[PDB]
RNA sequence: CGUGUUCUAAUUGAAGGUUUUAGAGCUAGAAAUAGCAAGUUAAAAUAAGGCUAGUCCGUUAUCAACUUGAAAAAGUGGCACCGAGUCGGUGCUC
DNA sequence: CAATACCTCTTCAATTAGAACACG
DNA sequence: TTTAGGTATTG
């Protein structure tokens, strides 16, 4: 006899219960525990609050790197293990000397100086080649034997840091000269293509190629230099091939198939020889000489210096920086010493001001220091050569910095190599392990192998050929690369929705193709002159057309049929077909695809050879690495000429199908012995579509379908919710609103409700790359014409101006950067149809009027003028595809009268499928009762209401939400949902198919939906009581019920429950604090003392415990009892529950009282003294938990006084609410005490309270608008939760935290249940 | 069916930052102090650690009390009416 | 004690898989 | 992307 209302969302999950008349009842429950109170009555409003759920993203961000770090120590390890045999004969302790190169002189067992022992020996390494790099170039450039321990230190130095693999292949260090080689590419080219020869033309191909300008702008600066060249020509594409890029020369060769090549890409040499063969191979020695430029070119940016002298540059490059720093160290120093030397210390002495030593000593970056001296060199004339060096960023540079991620591992491996080639003769074990040595650095576990699971890994994909230990030397054999390979991509794949044991075949499987072809033709009628009833195509008819026509052609047309087949062989001169549009929508393209490569049409049509054709397509779709694809394809290679294989690896498939294979041809009908395939083939008289086969009771198919949906019997609700997609913060709230339900039933005597109403409410760095890319492709200089930063792109008027390339969107003209206020932002889609602020709908144009009629998207006038202007942007990606489709709606037809009544539908009908699972789980869990017939029983009506429904209901009905007065409102939003949702299905039972879960004309559909919530309106002229005609049911009165909302809304008491969750996360702050004299620091490792070695700091504890015991005080060691809080941290937490006392006593507590060990999780709530309540923040911290119930008269006021969004109400009513705001003008001062009283009662914010007042009592002369939202600013103090600093309009108020947990313990502590109705109360005295 | 955003989840890799230690600091002076030469680099750890010792795992998710269970989760608390500062009373059941 | 105030790893790169959502 | 709990520091 009741209706439960619910309001879910990201953080809040409000609820409310309604009496038949929409009243909410007052019920009296018991109260457990020891306090004098044995029963307390509370009103049924149901409420909850909770922490925003955590994603798994940032957890993956660590879970990854922890495998990245530990394996980075396995790398340097295999160096030692191989080295530990010859290392021993040159030093006994050098290998343990890095092992303990962290500890202090005290704890450090072995000699302090690592490389040579005695400091005098080891100073020389530090003072001859201090930079490590200086060492590495020497061990390549010198042929004179040196210390093995020096050799290893260079080998580990590149393995620890190996470099990026975004460019794979081999480099030959003979891009010694870029300029000269080019004459050996062109020269190689000029001979190849005499008809148009080409000129060096005095070009500098180094400076005009190695300069740091854009990837595109350099071939430009080259082609302009070169004579008579196109860019997209064969040679401008090869100038674009060496600089790493995607350049398409097909237009020159007029190849049918596009071919964009890259050297960095894996399929470059295969992509070449399967392109080179297509051309004559004259083109090879034009090509591998282009590679030479890229290999020569690529090294350039890292080093612009001549490399003829140095075999190794990057290692060489940074020696460049030392002296480029060394000179500019003395120079700058000297320049301060010949002028201005009264501030020498701060730059050099002090590391806290961004001074250089601070720049080196202090934790300051390359950016900040450079920022510091920008005046200093600009107020110093001593150095002007340098000021240039700074602006380019080249000065006294660091040798470990951020841009050194652009370095390829092929010079790290390139300098590792020669050292082995330098000193292997004298060290025989080097050559015998050089491959091993290079195989650690060269190796990389690909993404698809999976972590080498030992079977003990949760995330582990890969199986193995053998069980012995995987090493980078025996990796290839041990793993099953394919077996591993399949798992990586198999797991994601969608399962059959009809069959969950059969995995789904790719989109391009023939059999899926056979179904797509067979079925579509299934429903075809054909008429001639002399047939009385148009008949279906029969078993022989259907088979033949496919047999000759479809294999034969990629698309099958209609007038193919009249002439190709009926006329050819059925012999109708003319025929009338009604099944299909102008061409069959179904293509055996996959069938078409095969022939080009296989070249044996009669092999495809062979039945025995079709399982290969289904295992090869799956093999091709699955993978994406051609080198890898070869493996699975040698299984069949004995069948084919080898030239097929080279072309067979080429075409790669993407996209997987919905439908399981066995279903297509394996689900057999016992009575009449055909598969789904066989059925679509021949049907006597009538050929069923697929959807018919699976739903005709006369066919056993569906009876064998139902057998697949149940088996397993679903999964438990926790298993179930987690699986469904969407926000992690929505699913964690999806789960709680059902536990609340099971109790809401459990409260009202397990009598299921009559209705359930549930509604769900609905970036700084990408905004600088969506723009940077386009104005490279769009080609403009508008970005360089005016620089802007990503710190300014959260205001759209500066955001859209650059997305529009500094030009209007409707009139074709430049725009001013500064007065972006006169310009007016416009919506591609009117707001009235649907509310949207998205950039895909947002745009900036000079005036709103120009686009078109307001009632429609911009009109035919502008799509003409501009369609071309909105192409390149789509073309350069500045706009987006969805944004465009609506942008050009003028010519389409536009928003028809059935279109505008479609968004108006979407506004008030929840089309969102994640609040359709929240619908389904409800009905199924509530209604387990079955009619004798197949039909179900629904004694609980599920309802979906959309935000706008209640969102409007308030501004028009005298009820205005204020989110920052209280945290009762989130629950209030369920009452309104409960009623209006039940006020609707009680007055319009027609709508039970778009408002209730469970199974042109639009010129009044517009009128049906835009009108429906009007029976709450007295005038517009409507009766005060409206009742449904059909059942005679009365479902509204505007005298009684409208007040029974206000009284349920006026209420002072509402259940608000911050959900008690145990905190779990990282141990402490990630930063590493220095060795300090406090016990607060946590040992980063067990064996290191934070007082000697430093460590992590300040972990928070998962749930605080209440310990009472006696602790020894003073010399006496006498023990006197105390009761306090020990918050258990998440590092001791794992060792706490194991034995609590044996742990607890280790921290000092003796004589410990066992049964009174009270675990108190986060957000725990105690009640003490005169009705004040508190929330446990932590062991030290309390949050402020006492709601202040806004009186109704006060609550309304905030929306009007604030006047949010200026005025959005009928202007005839803009008057009526205006006198009120000045009528109850003193309501202002009626808030202050009411505001104040809460502060004195519970908050104990007295110390800062005196300060809010002085700001208000001296701000009474300014207007209401300024003031209104500002008295709203202050409610964060009254709010639930932690205290936060807030500011009155011209002043800011600091927060007052709750530092101690002494106060709480004396007072009674309450465990409340999941809703707030069942309790357990305790008085904490003893 | 095609197209593209948005987000969700798993695998493989780079570059910083940081924490001690190794970079023989010197000259006066008893001495806290003041004078000057130096600085860019390397080692190593990057959640404690765990046992199943794998080149594995170690931050998601789930959490009233209470009874009972290894974990899952099953089980426990009258009805109504009049009122309204966070539940107060009344009447009945009991 | 609790009133005052500074502090909290970041920036990239490459590959798969799925819904949920909106256009032709 | 700014919260909100740890932590040395000051009147």
Swiss-Prot record:
The annotated consequence of residue 12 to A reads: Decreased DNA cleavage
Q: Give binding positions for Mn(2+) 3.
A: 1259, 1290
Q: Where is this region: PAM-interacting domain (PI)?
A: 1061-1326
Record-annotated residues binding Mn(2+) 1?
A: 7, 759
Q: Kindly give the InterPro entries that the UniProt entry links to this protein.
A: Cas9, Cas9-BH, Cas9_PI, Cas9_REC, Cas9_RuvC, HNH_CAS9, HNH_nuc, RNaseH_sf
HNH Cas9-type domain ranges (all copies): 763-908
Family membership: Belongs to the CRISPR-associated protein Cas9 family. Subtype II-A subfamily.
The consequence of inactivating this gene is: Loss of correct processing of pre-crRNA and tracrRNA. Loss of immunity against a plasmid with homology to CRISPR spacer sequences.
Please list the cofactors this protein needs: Mg(2+)
Positions annotated as active site in the UniProt record: 7 (for ruvc-like nuclease domain), 827 (proton acceptor for hnh nuclease domain)
Impact of mutating residue 75 to A? Moderately decreased DNA cleavage
Entry remark concerning the domains of this protein: Has 2 endonuclease domains. The discontinuous RuvC-like domain (approximately residues 1-62, 718-765 and 925-1102) recognizes and cleaves the target DNA noncomplementary to crRNA while the HNH nuclease domain (residues 810-872) cleaves the target DNA complementary to crRNA. Has a bilobed architecture with a recognition lobe (REC, residues 60-718) and a discontinuous nuclease lobe (NUC, residues 1-59 and 719-1368). The crRNA-target DNA lies in a channel between the 2 lobes. Binding of sgRNA induces large conformational changes further enhanced by target DNA binding. REC recognizes and binds differing regions of an artificial sgRNA in a sequence-independent manner. Deletions of parts of this lobe abolish nuclease activity.
Question: Is Signal set as a keyword in this record?
Answer: no
* Result for mutant: residue 759 to A: Only cleaves 1 DNA strand, probably the noncomplementary strand. Processes guide RNAs correctly. In vivo, loss of Cas9-mediated CRISPR interference in plasmid transformation
Activity regulation text: Only has nuclease activity when bound to both gRNAs (crRNA plus tracrRNA), which results in conformational changes in the protein and formation of a central channel which binds target DNA. Also requires interaction with PAM to trigger catalytic activity. Nuclease activity is inhibited by EDTA.
Give me the ranges of the annotated region ARM. 53-70
**Pfam families in alphabetical order:** Cas9-BH (PF16593), Cas9_PI (PF16595), Cas9_REC (PF16592), Cas9_RuvC (PF22702), HNH_4 (PF13395)
Give the GO molecular function terms.
Answer: 3'-5' exonuclease activity; DNA binding; DNA endonuclease activity; metal ion binding; RNA binding
Tell me what the record says results from residue 973 to A: Only cleaves 1 DNA strand, probably the noncomplementary strand. Processes guide RNAs correctly. In vivo, loss of Cas9-mediated CRISPR interference in plasmid transformation
Short sequence motif PAM substrate-binding: positions: 1295-1297
In the UniProt annotation, what is the result of changing residue 162 to A? Moderately decreased DNA cleavage
List the NCBIfam families.
Answer: cas_Csn1
Q: What is this protein called?
A: CRISPR-associated endonuclease Cas9/Csn1
């Amino acid at each position: 006899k009741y209706s439960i209302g619910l309001a879910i969302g990201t953080n809040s999950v409000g609820w409310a219960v309604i009496t038949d008349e929409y009243k909410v009842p007052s019920k009296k429950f018991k109260v457990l525990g020891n306090t004098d109170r044995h029963s307390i009555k509370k009103n049924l409003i149901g409420a909850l609050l909770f922490d925003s759920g955590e994603t798994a993203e940032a957890t993956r961000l660590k879970r990854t790197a922890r495998r990245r770090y530990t394996r980075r120590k396995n790398r340097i390890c295999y160096l030692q293990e191989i080295f530990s045999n010859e290392m021993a004969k040159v030093d006994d302790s050098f290998f343990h000397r890095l092992e303990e190169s962290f500890l202090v002189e005290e704890d450090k067992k072995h000699e302090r100086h690592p490389i040579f022992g005695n400091i005098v020996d080891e100073v020389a390494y530090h003072e001859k080649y201090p930079t490590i790099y200086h060492l590495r170039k020497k061990l390549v450039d010198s042929t004179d034997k040196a210390d093995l321990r020096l050799i290893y230190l260079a080998l580990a130095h590149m393995i620890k840091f190996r470099g990026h693999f975004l460019i794979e292949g081999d480099l030959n260090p003979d891009n010694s000269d870029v300029d000269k080689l080019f004459i050996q590419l062109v020269q190689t080219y000029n001979q190849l293509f005499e008809e148009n020869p080409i000129n060096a033309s005095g070009v500098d191909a180094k400076a005009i190629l190695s300069a740091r300008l854009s990837k595109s702008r350099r071939l430009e600066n080259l082609i302009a230099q070169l004579p008579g060249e196109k860019k997209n020509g064969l040679f401008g594409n090869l100038i674009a091939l060496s600089l790493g890029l995607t350049p398409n020369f097909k237009s020159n060769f007029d190849l049918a198939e596009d071919a964009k090549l890259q050297l960095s890409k894996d399929t470059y040499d295969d992509d070449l020889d399967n392109l080179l063969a297509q051309i004559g191979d004259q083109y090879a020695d034009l090509f591998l000489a282009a590679k030479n430029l890229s290999d020569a070119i690529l090294l350039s940016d890292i080093l612009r210096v001549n490399t003829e002298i140095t075999k190794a540059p990057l290692s060489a490059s940074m020696i460049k920086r030392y002296d480029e720093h060394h000179q500019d160290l003395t120079l700058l120093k000297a320049l301060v010493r010949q002028q201005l030397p009264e501030k020498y210390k701060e730059i050099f002495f002090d590391q806290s001001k961004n001074g250089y030593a601070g720049y080196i000593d202090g934790g300051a970056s390359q950016e900040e220091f450079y920022k510091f001296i920008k005046p200093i060199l600009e107020k110093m004339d001593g150095t002007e050569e340098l000021l240039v060096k700074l602006n380019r960023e080249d000065l006294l540079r660091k040798q470990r910095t951020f841009d050194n991620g652009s370095i390829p591992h092929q010079i790290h491996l390139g300098e590792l190599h020669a050292i082995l080639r330098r000193q292997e003769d004298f060290y025989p074990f080097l050559k015998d392990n050089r491959e091993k040595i290079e195989k650690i650095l060269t190796f990389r576990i690909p993404y698809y192998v999976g972590p080498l699971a030992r079977g003990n890994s949760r995330f582990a994909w890969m199986t193995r050929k053998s069980e012995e230990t995987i090493t980078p030397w025996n990796f290839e054999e041990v793993v099953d690369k394919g077996a591993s390979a399949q798992s990586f991509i198999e797991r994601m794949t969608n399962f059959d929705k009809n069959l969950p044991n059969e995995k789904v075949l790719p989109k391009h499987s023939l059999l899926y193709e056979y179904f797509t072809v067979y079925n579509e033709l299934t429903k075809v009628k054909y008429v001639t002159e002399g047939m009385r009833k148009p008949a279906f195509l029969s078993g022989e008819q259907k088979k033949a057309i496919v047999d000759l026509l479809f294999k034969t052609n990629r698309k099958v047309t209609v007038k193919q049929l009249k002439e190709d087949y009926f006329k050819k062989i059925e012999c109708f001169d003319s025929v009338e077909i009604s099944g299909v549009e102008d061409r069959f929508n179904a293509s055996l393209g996959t069938y078409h695809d095969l022939l080009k490569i296989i070249k044996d049409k009669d092999f495809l049509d062979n039945e025995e050879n079709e399982d290969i054709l289904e295992d090869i397509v799956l093999t091709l779709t699955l993978f994406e690495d051609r080198e890898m694809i070869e493996e699975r394809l040698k299984t069949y290679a004995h069948l084919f000429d080898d030239k097929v294989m080279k072309q067979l690896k080429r075409r790669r498939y993407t996209g997987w199908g919905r439908l399981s294979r066995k279903l297509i041809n394996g689900i057999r009908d016992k009575q009449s012995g055909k598969t789904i395939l066989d059925f679509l083939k021949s049907d006597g008289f009538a050929n069923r579509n697929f959807m018919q086969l699976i739903h005709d009771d006369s066919l056993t198919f569906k009876e064998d379908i139902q057998k697949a949906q149940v088996s397993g019997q679903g999964d438990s609700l926790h298993e179930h919710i987690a699986n469904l997609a969407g926000s992690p913060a929505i699913k964690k709230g999806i789960l709680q609103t059902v536990k609340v339900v099971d109790e809401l039933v459990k409260v009202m005597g397990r009598h299921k409700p009559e209705n359930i109403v549930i509604e769900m409410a609905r970036n700084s760095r990408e905004r600088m790359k969506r723009i940077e890319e386009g104005i490279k492709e769009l080609g403009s200089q508008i970005l360089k014409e005016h620089p802007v930063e990503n710190t300014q792109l959260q205001n759209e008027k500066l955001y859209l101006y650059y997305l529009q390339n500094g030009r209007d969107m409707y009139v074709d003209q430049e725009l001013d950067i500064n007065r972006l206020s006169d310009y007016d932002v416009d919506a591609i889609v009117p707001q009235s149809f649907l509310k949207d602020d998205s950039i895909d709908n947002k745009v900036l144009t000079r005036s709103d009027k120009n686009r078109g009629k307001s009632d429609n998207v911009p009109s035919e006038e502008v799509v003409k003028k501009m369609k071309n202007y909105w192409r390149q942007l789509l073309n350069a990606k500045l706009i987006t595809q969805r944004k465009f489709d609506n942008l050009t709606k003028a010519e389409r037809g536009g928003l028809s009268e059935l279109d505008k009544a479609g968004f108006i539908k979407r506004q008030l009908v929840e089309t969102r499928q994640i609040t359709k699972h929240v619908a389904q789980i409800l009905d199924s869990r509530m209604n387990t009762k079955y009619d004798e017939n197949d039909k179900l029983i629904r004694e609980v009506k599920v309802i979906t209401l959309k935000s706008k429904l209640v969102s409007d209901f308030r501004k028009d009905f005298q009820f205005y939400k204020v989110r920052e007065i209280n945290n009762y409102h989130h629950a209030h939003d369920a009452y309104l949902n409960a009623v209006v949702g039940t006020a609707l299905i009680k007055k319009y039972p027609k709508l039970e198919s778009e408002f209730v879960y469970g199974d042109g004309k639009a010129t009044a559909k517009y009128f049906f939906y835009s009108n429906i919530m009007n029976f709450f309106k007295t005038e517009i002229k409507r009766p005060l009581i409206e009742t449904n005609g059909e059942t005679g049911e009365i479902v509204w009165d505007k005298g009684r019920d409208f007040a029974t909302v206000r009284k349920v809304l006026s209420m002072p008491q509402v259940n608000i429950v911050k959900k008690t969750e145990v905190q779990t996360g990282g141990f402490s702050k990630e930063s590493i604090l220095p060795k300090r004299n406090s016990d607060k620091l946590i040992a980063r490792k067990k064996d290191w003392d934070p007082k000697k070695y430093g460590g992590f700091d300040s972990p928070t504890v998962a749930y605080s415990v209440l310990v009472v015991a006696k602790v020894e005080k003073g010399k006496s060691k006498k023990l006197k009892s105390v009761k306090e809080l020990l918050g258990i941290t998440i590092m001791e937490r794992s060792s706490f529950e194991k034995n609590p006392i044996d742990f607890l006593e280790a921290k000092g507590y003796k004589e410990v009282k066992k049964d009174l060990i009270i675990k108190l999780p986060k957000y725990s709530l105690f009640e003490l003294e005169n009705g004040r309540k508190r929330m446990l923040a932590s062991a030290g911290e309390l949050q402020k938990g006492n709601e202040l119930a806004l009186p109704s008269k006060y609550v309304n006021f905030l929306y009007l006084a604030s006047h949010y969004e200026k005025l959005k109400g009928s202007p005839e009513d803009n008057e009526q609410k205006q006198l009120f705001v000045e009528q109850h003008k003193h309501y202002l001062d009626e808030i202050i005490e009411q505001i104040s009283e809460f502060s004195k009662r519970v908050i104990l914010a007295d110390a800062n309270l005196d300060k809010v007042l002085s700001a208000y009592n001296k701000h009474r002369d300014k207007p209401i608008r300024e003031q209104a939202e500002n008295i709203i600013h202050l409610f964060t103090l009254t709010n639930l939760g932690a205290p936060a600093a807030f500011k009155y309009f011209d002043t800011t108020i600091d927060r007052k935290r709750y530092t101690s947990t002494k106060e709480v313990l004396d007072a009674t502590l309450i465990h409340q249940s999941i809703t707030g109705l069942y309790e357990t109360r305790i008085d904490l005295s003893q």
